[PDB]
Amino acid sequence: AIHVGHHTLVFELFGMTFNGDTILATAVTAVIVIALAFYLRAKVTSTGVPSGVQLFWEALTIQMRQQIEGSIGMKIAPFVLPLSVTIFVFILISNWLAVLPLQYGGADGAAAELYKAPASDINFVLALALFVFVCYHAAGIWRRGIVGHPIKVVKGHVAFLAPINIVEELAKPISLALRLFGNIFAGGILVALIAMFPWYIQWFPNAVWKTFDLFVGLIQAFIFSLLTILYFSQSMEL
Amino acid sequence: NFLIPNGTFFAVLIIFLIVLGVISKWVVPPISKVLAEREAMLAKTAADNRKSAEQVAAAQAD
Amino acid sequence: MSIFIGQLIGFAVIAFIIVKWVVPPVRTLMRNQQEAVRAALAESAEAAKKLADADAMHAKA
Amino acid sequence: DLDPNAIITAGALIGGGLIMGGGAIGAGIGDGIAGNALISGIARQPEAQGRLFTPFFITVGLVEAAYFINLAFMALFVFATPGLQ
Amino acid sequence: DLDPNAIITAGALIGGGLIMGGGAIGAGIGDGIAGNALISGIARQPEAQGRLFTPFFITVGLVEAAYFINLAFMALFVFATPGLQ
Amino acid sequence: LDPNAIITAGALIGGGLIMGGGAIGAGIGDGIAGNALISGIARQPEAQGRLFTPFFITVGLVEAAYFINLAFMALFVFATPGLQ
Amino acid sequence: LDPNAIITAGALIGGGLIMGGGAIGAGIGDGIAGNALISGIARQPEAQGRLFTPFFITVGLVEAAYFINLAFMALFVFATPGLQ
Amino acid sequence: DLDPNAIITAGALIGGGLIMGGGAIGAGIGDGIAGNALISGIARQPEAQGRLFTPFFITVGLVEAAYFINLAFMALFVFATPGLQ
Amino acid sequence: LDPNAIITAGALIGGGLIMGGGAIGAGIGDGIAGNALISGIARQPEAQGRLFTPFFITVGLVEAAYFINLAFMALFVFATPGLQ
Amino acid sequence: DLDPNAIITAGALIGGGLIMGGGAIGAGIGDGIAGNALISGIARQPEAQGRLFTPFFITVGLVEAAYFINLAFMALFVFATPGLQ
Amino acid sequence: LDPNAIITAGALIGGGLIMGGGAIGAGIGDGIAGNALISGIARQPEAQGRLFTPFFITVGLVEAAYFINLAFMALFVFATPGLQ
Amino acid sequence: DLDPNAIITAGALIGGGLIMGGGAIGAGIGDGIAGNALISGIARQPEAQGRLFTPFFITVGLVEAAYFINLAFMALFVFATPGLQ
């Protein structure tokens, strides 16, 4: 027994089902991020030695601003910077909160996690990917009217490949979501699989996998942010 | 099944939005101001060094 | 329970690895950036004082 | 005896698996090759990066298309299985 | 004791899956290689885009012709299955 | 016999194909991208920093296929479509 | 079990294998030949004039191998040998 | 009268074999390519040896990892077979 | 059921495998050899005459394998060994 | 009226064959690529041989391992078959 | 049902797999070796003969594997081990 | 109503075919790549033919070791089938 899926704390509202566990995980990640943000806002010092939180936040901002300026000028697309930094920090915290020892035995021989990475739920990745999709398409609309944007995305860089371009435009959101999903989803299974070992043998593969999963989550957050920035740059040109 | 989207899609979105709002209003603007002020401070330090270098010579000349 | 104990031992191993071989370099990077900022502030202060002294000398001459 | 729909569904699952495996191989290797080109070009001409993305992603576009097209048809195999009774 | 159409449909689905897997592998890798050439060329000669996009698109046209011929034959296999009775 | 058994065998084989193809693509693409990265760094070591961004973009583009395949394999073997 | 059904399923699988292999070969060979052509034209533009000669030979040797498969695939599916 | 668990187990064994074959191909070829880059770099700039090991182990980290992931999903298939009756 | 049906289905699948592998090998080998030829003619325009002799050897060898497979495919399909 | 062990053993043999085929493909191609790098390095720098064997053995170590793991699991598939009864 | 039918179908599929692998390996390896030969002859015409000693060795290895497969394929399809 | 040994033998034959196909692919491609390196090295450096055979022989030995281990295990599969009663 591995119990793939099987969300807990599921409830109903307005004839719509909600996976309580993923909402709780997302809320915990948001609380952590907001606490970091407010700790920064109470410690920003332009005339002093920066604190660790300020160093981390400004490193993130510098990286995202450098990427934007490399792709599309900051003056052209200022909002992409907050969008990219928030996406990065959200995904990174969500993935790295899984390293904590919140896994236990469910009394049926199957492992159960008190905290499960929200990106292992299709709803989370779909929300992020579709928000980015709508955002950069709206940015392209603002750049080239209600009309030039669909025209230019359909024709793309080379017009006679219009069909492929359309597929490409549909592939951007899906690839953004599923990729992330898989990266986390697989991880959720691996630990569960490692839970089948006895403790005196479980400790080692679990340690190795979670140590690697730290880097996996970092890389996934970075890739999501970079691709969001670059899609924004593509949608806003000429 | 697990690949079928649910109502959670909205809930998560809402949370993300508020986080973005915070990051948009209390993280990125202050950080941009700090970075710009640091760069202006470095430029001002270089300019002050240059003015000192030219003035130490102008005073001797005059 | 058993899987919880095994996973906790694994997490202890992870934390040991992180503190032993990851915390030192990142802490050094943070210290380096902090010292760079502090040195930049010192450069600003000393350059302002140098400009003040040069202006005083020029006024004297 | 046996249910014809079961045989058709097993065949559809195997066919969709083949579709997605082939698409995966093609996409992964093609993207790796294009990224090798991009990484080399950047390593040799830093400032060229800005002008390298325009062709690079064009390539990737095509390389992605097939994959996702395959994915689309895989859905038709496992959710709208043609010939299923 | 089974409907022959079921066996034929399962075979047709598996064959179409093979066709599309092979087509996807070929398309992805060929496009990746041609795009690697294009990216490297534009890296060496930033002003060569005009001259390069012709051979690059000839190569892409050949590769996509193979891919879409495979796609058409998969459509034949799956929707109008030859030998279906 | 049980139709579900045949459908499950087909789903297992299909998921095996999906994951095998994904692993092949991921391994070879990652190897190629890492080869580009190592060659670039050996040629001019101080690009250690500027190369990582395009390298990780390539890694993301490569892993997209692999992990989309992993997701669809999980669908095949845990929520099998058309399972009677 | 009608013998023609088993034979037709086997023939369809075989034709699918034939076309998949042919497409893999054709796509990758065309990509490699086109890579050579694109690099050659990038190095020197006038060489284009001559480069299309060997290129068409290479593609000629590639596409041919593909098209033969096509024919045989047809033989497999439309006039199945040993159809019984 | 054939036991369905037998068919499910045979399918699981075939799927696990496919997973491990794909993982082995990917790991072997990716590690070989990364090692080719490493050997060429060390031949070119011996004193860069150490500074080359950083990207190398990253590539291996992203290659070998995938292989071992496949390994896990093989064990599942052949030790906790999904859908087993 | 009829043994002929099973044997013919197996023969068709085997012949499909033979031809698919032959097509993959021929296409990719011809592409690689033609890439070498195109690059050589690009770098040294006057070398076109000299490069055919190796190129026709390489291609020859490659084609050999393909056509040998083709022959065996026919033996599988039209003269199925073990048929009964 | 078929022995379940027969079906499971046939599946195990096919899976082990897939495992060994993938392992051999990966091992052969990876070793060939690493050796190509080694041969090129020794050709360009005849004296570099000494050092080049260090990274080479690493690459082979990362390749052959992937092979010899597959081997082990193949021995598991066809000698202690999971799910057998 | 005749067990020999099942064994013969399995033998035909196995022989098809063996020939597919042999053809792929032979074609691609010969293409790569010939690419090296053509590039070397383009670079060093004086070496045209000199390069044939290693080239043949390479081919001698590649083809050898191919032909070994061929032998075993015969053993699979003509004297099938396990008929009963 | 099939002999269990018949199904086992068919599975063993398919598995051995997979073993030999994978081994042949790996051996051919690895030997081709090693020979590519050898030929290029001899072309660039005329007198390196004598000293290049050592790394070339090492690479070919690894590749052929993989191939012949596969051959031995195919012989095991086909002539002494594990699990065959």
Overall outline of chain B = rod-shaped
Could you please say which CATH topology of chain D applies here?
F1FO ATP Synthase
Order of helices and strands of chain B: HH
Helix content of chain D: over 70%
**Beta strands of chain D, count:** 0
The name of the CATH architecture of chain D is Up-down Bundle
PDB class: hydrolase
Keywords: complex, synthase, hydrolase
Assembly: dodecameric
Entry title: Mycobacterium smegmatis ATP synthase Fo combined all classes
Kindly describe this structure.
Chain A has 238 residues and is mainly alpha-helical. Chain A has one domain (11-235). Chain A is built from seven helices and four strands. Chain A has helices spanning 20-41, 52-71, 80-96, 122-143, 145-155, 162-194, 199-235, and strands spanning 11-13, 16-18, 103-105, 111-113. The longest helix of chain A is centred in the last third of the chain and has 37 residues, at 199-235. Chain B has a domain at 28-62. In chain B, 85% of the residues lie in helices and 0% in strands. Chain C contains one helix and no strands. Chain C is rod-shaped. The longest helix of chain C is centred in the middle third of the chain and has 59 residues, at 2-60. Chain C is an all-alpha fold and 61 residues long. Chain D has a single domain (4-80), classed as Up-down Bundle (F1FO ATP Synthase). Chain D has two helices and no strands. Chain D has helices at 4-44, 49-78. In chain D, helix 1 packs antiparallel against helix 2. The chains are: A mainly alpha (238), B mainly alpha (62), C mainly alpha (61), D mainly alpha (85). Chains in contact: A-B, A-C, A-D, A-F, A-H, B-C, B-F, D-E, D-F, E-G, F-H, G-I, H-J, I-K, J-L, K-L.
